[PDB]
Amino acid sequence: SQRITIDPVTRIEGHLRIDCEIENGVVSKAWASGTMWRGMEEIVKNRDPRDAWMIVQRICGVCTTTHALSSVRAAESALNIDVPVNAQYIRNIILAAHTTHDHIVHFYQLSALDWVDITSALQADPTKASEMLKGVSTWHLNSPEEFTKVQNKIKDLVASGQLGIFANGYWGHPAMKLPPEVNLIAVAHYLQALECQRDANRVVALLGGKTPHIQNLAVGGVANPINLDGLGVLNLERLMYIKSFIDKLSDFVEQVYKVDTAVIAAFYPEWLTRGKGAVNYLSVPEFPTDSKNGSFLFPGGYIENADLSSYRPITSHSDEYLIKGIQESAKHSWYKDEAPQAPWEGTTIPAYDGWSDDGKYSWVKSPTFYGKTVEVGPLANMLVKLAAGRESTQNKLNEIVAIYQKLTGNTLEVAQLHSTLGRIIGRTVHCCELQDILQNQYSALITNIGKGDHTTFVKPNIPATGEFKGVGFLEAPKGMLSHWMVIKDGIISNYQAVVPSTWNSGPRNFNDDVGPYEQSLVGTPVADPNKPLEVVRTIHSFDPCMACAVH
Amino acid sequence: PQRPPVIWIGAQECTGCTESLLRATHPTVENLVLETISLEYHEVLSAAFGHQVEENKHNALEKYKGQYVLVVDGSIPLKDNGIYCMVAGEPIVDHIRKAAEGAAAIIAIGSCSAWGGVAAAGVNPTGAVSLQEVLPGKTVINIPGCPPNPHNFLATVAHIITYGKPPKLDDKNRPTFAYGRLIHEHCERRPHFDAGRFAKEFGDEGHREGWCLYHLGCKGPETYGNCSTLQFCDVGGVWPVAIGHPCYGCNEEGIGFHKGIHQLANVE
Ligand code: SF4
Ligand code: SF4
Ligand code: FCO
Ligand code: F3S
Ligand SMILES: [Cl-]
Ligand SMILES: [Mg+2]
Ligand code: NI
């Protein structure tokens, strides 16, 4: 038996330390630690409510857009403002296109090098690699010629002796299972992914004014001026340009990312039987389409003890059952006040005292829902949509299972989704369904402008006396996000962010119960404790964001 | 589904207005002709030639009577009974008047068809005139420039298709989204004009700091257009003034092809 530390964890956002006790070749106990704090909740305090979104957007530049949108929703909640429907269409297109970029970059740039051996790709036969994909994908850039050009780029990098960020990798590890040909296919798709994510961010830029960090929001709606006949504003030529980029995303997502997800599961089937982090799941509904902040295109809900048949639907961002359940504790975190706190009454008082296995070991707080630990993110999101009987989600999951069946002769049941690969699959399903969200909301905007509605902004009033509490919910790429604003005498008197990586990465809670990262690792086989690739594989499946988790 | 029909006829054209389509991105020229419209006549791209292509024009004018958009580039020459442009043995003015009879909408793409352009300048050797002068009973939509940004044309066609009418027009029948403002009333070098920071010759110190081009002959103060905002080629930052040369006034009758490059504009 022995104790290891993984510090830094790479191919994530931000600063993470993972500790593991290993006994008889398996992890017996783990600790997750966020090692950087800024105090973003304190920086935004005492300001005008209308200013918060530009400051708290900077909680994270990987999940850019998300904290901006959650912050304006929180002020609109406190103030009782109904957002114009055109402002909802624009906010929705931005969030859907951003999330497409975010999921593609996670699968390829951040996670693929846990599963893919770039050295092995030098041994591949490019023709055999291309032949393996016949009747599995219709993608137009799977030729032997494409794969030979990619293999020659790898050959040149190796021959230079400067491997840089590709160096001292896990090349030849016993947990690396792909044949040479599938390693070469994956590297070709890694490079092609960079073009698709760039198109997704061109959609975001044309509505946001730039990305990273959009600049088109307001408490009350958006800053885009809709005028089909205007010079220098959001006219029909600018809308046509947006549509030209929306139409470029589908083929890569459906014919490359969706297919690769099924192929990784076919070669790594034991990863369907490990990495369960929780038995409770939460997601919020997303993409409102009415004039009163509701009528969501995607559903939300709460699953308890993995029972889909008895789940509780969530159809409103004003649901008092959801609001009343959320608390955070700092018993095992570097803050002073330890008992569970509702976020409108939250404090964030730093109290660093160094690392202790049984005391404080993280800057991440510990969130609970009516006293229980909960997993958020794409696995939660997919399982809630299956509980709701959403036929689009059923059908997309079935397409991934059908490729896995063609490759292995085996099928995939819902029980196998509570796992490191199920989490990966839920993310892929979400990216696929978002392409229909983009087509739907573009068409809705064009049709509404044609009815003569050009409205985008309702100017707020803020009473100079009274105390007003608001909450803004959002289904972010990593899971349910909430921003909690208290207004007193016209200024922000409290501001608390509860972020999806806070739920999943937070340390042991007030009752010493284990959160999803720490739970998921128990039982992990580790062939070489000096090179713990198997631990990093499960942690990457949650898509850690530690600027998000800690703020 | 069926696509909206277009008939394109060139008169005294240089082909630059067709070539603008090969730079377009929203839509690209391949998506324009396979997805957005049915291009029923266009001599630059047509597989058919000669008697076959003249039959396919006549068949389309009948099939789509009341439905097609007619587009013309180039000026129309009236001198000596039409003979300075003859196609299939007939004056181009006769082909254009015949096609105008059944059109749902009529567009003059480029300065030549919009107001006579370079071909009508100086002594005007051929008696070249605008499309509106040849069709006095019709409302001609004018999309000037030499050539315009292609999307000034493509977004006008899209408004007709999507919303069933033309875009809003000014008193010269130009779409307001593209021609509603003077270039100098939306130019990023106006701070330099205001401060008296001027380039005096190409390659001087002010020119090499991106100062105002007024004293090089810039016609922005007297030209309506979107060249400083939409710009050209969708790469970012590309229009004549941004590259270092004054506006010549190519959009605007009486400016481009009349005033010298280095002649000073009137300022309102
Ligand atoms: S407007 Fe300019 S580009 Fe178009 S036909 Fe005339 S000379 Fe050529
Ligand atoms: S004169 Fe020309 S360069 Fe100077 S501000 Fe006016 S339009 Fe711009
Ligand atoms: N997605 C994302 Fe960032 C995290 N965790 C937020 O919200
Ligand atoms: S010469 Fe023409 S292209 Fe624009 S910058 Fe002046 S109107
Ligand atoms: Cl409008
Ligand atoms: Mg917080
Ligand atoms: Ni983030």
From Swiss-Prot, chain A:
Membrane protein topology class: Peripheral membrane protein
Q: Which GO terms describe its molecular function?
A: ferredoxin hydrogenase activity; hydrogenase (acceptor) activity; nickel cation binding
Q: Which UniProt keywords apply?
A: Cell membrane, Membrane, Metal-binding, Nickel, Oxidoreductase
Cofactor mode of binding and number, as noted: Binds 1 nickel ion per subunit.
Cellular compartments annotated: Cell membrane
Q: Which Pfam families match?
A: NiFeSe_Hases
The UniProt subunit note reads as follows:
Heterodimer of a large and a small subunit.
Family, similarity comment: Belongs to the [NiFe]/[NiFeSe] hydrogenase large subunit family.
**Protein's name according to its UniProt entry:** Hydrogenase-2 large chain
Q: What is the lineage of its organism?
A: Bacteria, Pseudomonadati, Pseudomonadota, Gammaproteobacteria, Enterobacterales
Task: Name the gene for this chain.
Answer: hybC
Swiss-Prot record, chain B:
Keyword 4Fe-4S found = yes
Summarize the PTM comment: Exported by the Tat system. The position of the signal peptide cleavage has been experimentally proven. Can also be exported by the Sec system.
Reaction(s) the record says it catalyses: H2 + A = AH2
Places the protein is found: Cell membrane; Periplasm
Membrane topology (UniProt): Peripheral membrane protein
List the keywords (alphabetical).
Answer: 3Fe-4S, 4Fe-4S, Cell membrane, Iron, Iron-sulfur, Membrane, Metal-binding, Oxidoreductase, Periplasm, Signal
- Binding site residues for [4Fe-4S] cluster 2: 184, 187, 212, 218
Enzyme Commission code: 1.12.99.6
Give the note describing cofactor binding and stoichiometry: Binds 2 [4Fe-4S] clusters.
Return the broad EC class. Answer: oxidoreductase
Any one GO MF annotation of this record? ferredoxin hydrogenase activity
Q: Binding residues for [3Fe-4S] cluster, per the UniProt record? A: 227, 247, 250
**Listed GO cellular component terms?**
[Ni-Fe] hydrogenase complex; ferredoxin hydrogenase complex; membrane; periplasmic space; plasma membrane
Cofactor(s) recorded in Swiss-Prot or TrEMBL: [4Fe-4S] cluster; [3Fe-4S] cluster
Its chief place of residence is membrane
GO annotation (BP), single: anaerobic respiration
Q: Which domain of life is it from?
A: Bacteria
Detail which positions bind [4Fe-4S] cluster 1: 14, 17, 112, 146
The protein's job, in short, is: This is one of three E.coli hydrogenases synthesized in response to different physiological conditions. HYD2 is involved in hydrogen uptake.
The record's comment on protein family reads: Belongs to the [NiFe]/[NiFeSe] hydrogenase small subunit family.
Oligomeric form and interacting partners = Heterodimer of a large and a small subunit.
Protein's UniProt name: Hydrogenase-2 small chain
Instruction: State the species of origin.
Output: Escherichia coli (strain K12)
Which gene is annotated as encoding this protein in its UniProt record? hybO
